[PDB]
């Protein structure tokens, strides 16, 4: 990672998600980068849960988020929850008003906007401290949307959105943590600035900066270093789980860390991806294939190998001279775990998809010809297979085959049979289903269920 600017004394960073649900890949990037810089600079990392929008809080997320961070391997030093800090935001609203940096605006929003867009001040902007403080206190008994606190910025700012932006609003809704205790809530740019300052954040790594600068200015605070990186290319998902067509936060159709973990994607793969992309200023474009590539490099060195025949067809090897005992390593680089032994006696299951007529070599076993729907023995050796132009195919002895299924990344179910040794696997094991893909065992027999990672 590139060096941080203006480092003086201890470095303090934060990761600040909203509790709208568990973490997704986008979150992982901010979490990893901030964690990596805290490690690099021997500094601290603050987890700040930004739950100041009562209608957008998922109660389960408070526990899910730190669990997801642990999964990623992120360590941190303090956990702060914004809904525990309401009186702090109120305190600093009063201070900001006393310093002449904010006012309570009771204008109709559209009438205010018309003035604002022409660089003209509303009457509220001219009120004094005690006048504003009285209006502020009144907000606590007013209706949703009836008054706001606005930060005094520049009414002639080139960017209209930065012109006297809103720091506090009234919302009449039950918060899942604090219930109906509060109706006056901070807007993100206010609570973020106040918390970054009070918690001692030195470097912010993730319009907004420009807005917050006015707050720091008015309060007499030095802002943190701001470092912004390019885009890489939750509420909709939560709705889906509630309605249907998502089984949960770990449904493979979702980009949550939970869903990808369930498929056997390693957190190390995610960390490596985010680190190598770094704090690149320019927009980057990662594909899932990029993540799969990193994961494959990890799994291919250790994942145990088995034959799973999807949509199997049961076929007699007609003319087999006699039984053939086949040995094949569980992993060619790890002799310690030994070899599978497959007993070819008469019938086999072959994967049925795109199974056309012609010569085949059942891996490590025998060469056959499939035609007219019949599988006929040809020979046994590798040279004969080359002479035939036989295509390699995985296979399962019929006598000892086990039922299995694999849930694919679109949540579709692929049914088939797997070789007997697969019964040794336990939930969480991640294996290579040869010539099919890597997959994590999600539930054990009878009837093993795997979740597909990638080819
Ligand atoms: Ca540290
Ligand atoms: Zn006004």
Curated annotation (Swiss-Prot):
GO cellular component: cytosol; protein-containing complex
Free-text function comment from the UniProt entry: Catalyzes the attachment of glutamate to tRNA(Glu) in a two-step reaction: glutamate is first activated by ATP to form Glu-AMP and then transferred to the acceptor end of tRNA(Glu).
Annotated compartments: Cytoplasm
Family the entry assigns: Belongs to the class-I aminoacyl-tRNA synthetase family. Glutamate--tRNA ligase type 2 subfamily.
Stretches that traverse the bilayer: none
Primary location recorded for the protein, binned into one broad class: cytoplasm
Keyword hit for Protein biosynthesis: yes
Single GO molecular function: ATP binding
Name of the protein in its database record: Glutamate--tRNA ligase
Keywords attached to this entry: Aminoacyl-tRNA synthetase, ATP-binding, Cytoplasm, Ligase, Nucleotide-binding, Protein biosynthesis
Top-level class of the enzyme under EC nomenclature: ligase
Swiss-Prot/TrEMBL catalytic activity: tRNA(Glu) + L-glutamate + ATP = L-glutamyl-tRNA(Glu) + AMP + diphosphate
Motif ('HIGH' region): 17-27
Gene (UniProt): gltX
This enzyme's EC code(s): 6.1.1.17
Record's signal peptide: none
